[model samples]
Target: MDIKSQTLYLNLSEAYKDPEVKANEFLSKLVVQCAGKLTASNSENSYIEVISLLSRGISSYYLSHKRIIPSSMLTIYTQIQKDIKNGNIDTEKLRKYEIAKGLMSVPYIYF
Candidate 1:
């Protein structure tokens, strides 16, 4: 994914005070969105894979930012996982999140 787009970077900068936060939020949103989409597609296995990817990405982010991680981070992550596992996440509600992540990871951004 491209990481140098001015518009995208500006958006990320506005959303997150730090680069790590931007990355974590991007991945977290992707996971939730992917899970929702997969559920809508009725592909449980694919949803699981997406959740796994999200979990790994989140864990990495947490490990790196433990010193500065916000208190709400854990709660958000846990809730996303819970929603995914319970098939309670809806793609329509997560469309914006997906778009944000997609923009971050576009080939032009390299992120």
Candidate 2:
């Protein structure tokens, strides 16, 4: 993945209101945990599956709350690019992210 730790941390920071950084912290932890889970897997398919699920869960939560992030906001993704400008994420991986992000536009999806 072309994600950067800094951008991820910043996005987590923005995911919450002040005095309740717990949500942001939880997201940050989830990101790390998911990364670890994917990395520790024996098969590539297993890694992709785990990451897909993680993205879906996160997207669902945001969508349920009516908090779909706009594509114009580059704070997080841009940071990821900055972190790993040398390598590009696979097309399948990018597709998963896009799907998760796109779920916000669908109605009655129960997140």
Highest TM-score scorer: 2
TM-score of 1: 0.33
RMSD of each: 13.6, 8.1
Q: What digit string (tens of lDDT, one per residue) describes model 2 on residues 24-106?
A: 55444555565455444444344445434433445544644554443322333343333223233343664565575453222
Model 2: lDDT to the true structure: 0.41
lDDT of 1 by residue, 49-90 (tens): 343344344344645446454433333334434444445544
Q: TM-score per candidate, in order?
A: 0.33, 0.36
Residue 33 of model 2 has an lDDT of 61
Best-fitting candidate, scored by lDDT: 2
Residue 89's lDDT in candidate 2: 32
In candidate 1, residue 75 scores what lDDT?
31
